[PDB]
Amino acid sequence: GYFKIYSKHTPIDLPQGFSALEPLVDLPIGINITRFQTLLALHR
Amino acid sequence: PLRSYGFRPTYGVGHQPYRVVVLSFELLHAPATVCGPKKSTNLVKNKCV
Ligand SMILES: *[C@@H]1O[C@H](CO)[C@@H](O)[C@H](O)[C@H]1NC(C)=O
């Protein structure tokens, strides 16, 4: 029931290297997940 | 279906307006939530504690 997110923003097809990601949030939600989508900013 | 109280200051007890609040807890499924406050205790050093 915990939805974890790790993240990192590192400035520079993906390149080649190693970088460990740190916890971002801790969310006691309870939510079940089986599918998801994404959102994009269009050109208008 | 609706009436209204009155409440003039010159009422006896049992007819003056009382304010009522009720608290109700429920622990559905959360792993941990709002708990009581924590009583600290300072912190000493260089001692077996
Ligand atoms: C998530 O779905 C499962 C069945 O796939 C169910 O048994 C479980 O109770 C659900 N979890 C929550 C938090 O609702």
Curated annotation (Swiss-Prot), chain A:
Glycans are attached at N32. It comes from the Viruses. Binds to host ACE2. RBD also interacts with the N-linked glycan on 'Asn-90' of ACE2. Cleavage of S generates a polybasic C-terminal sequence on S1 that binds to host Neuropilin-1 (NRP1) and Neuropilin-2 (NRP2) receptors. Interacts with host integrin alpha-5/beta-1 (ITGA5:ITGB1) and with ACE2 in complex with integrin alpha-5/beta-1 (ITGA5:ITGB1). May interact via cytoplasmic c-terminus with M protein. May interact (via N-terminus) with host bilirubin and biliverdin, thereby preventing antibody binding to the SARS-CoV-2 spike NTD via an allosteric mechanism. Attaches the virion to the cell membrane by interacting with host receptor, initiating the infection. The major receptor is host ACE2. When S2/S2' has been cleaved, binding to the receptor triggers direct fusion at the cell membrane. When S2/S2' has not been cleaved, binding to the receptor results in internalization of the virus by endocytosis using host TFRC and GRM2 and leading to fusion of the virion membrane with the host endosomal membrane. Alternatively, may use NRP1/NRP2 and integrin as entry receptors. This is Spike protein S1. It comes from Severe acute respiratory syndrome coronavirus 2 (2019-nCoV). The gene is S. The chain holds residues 199 to 246 of 1273 of the full protein.
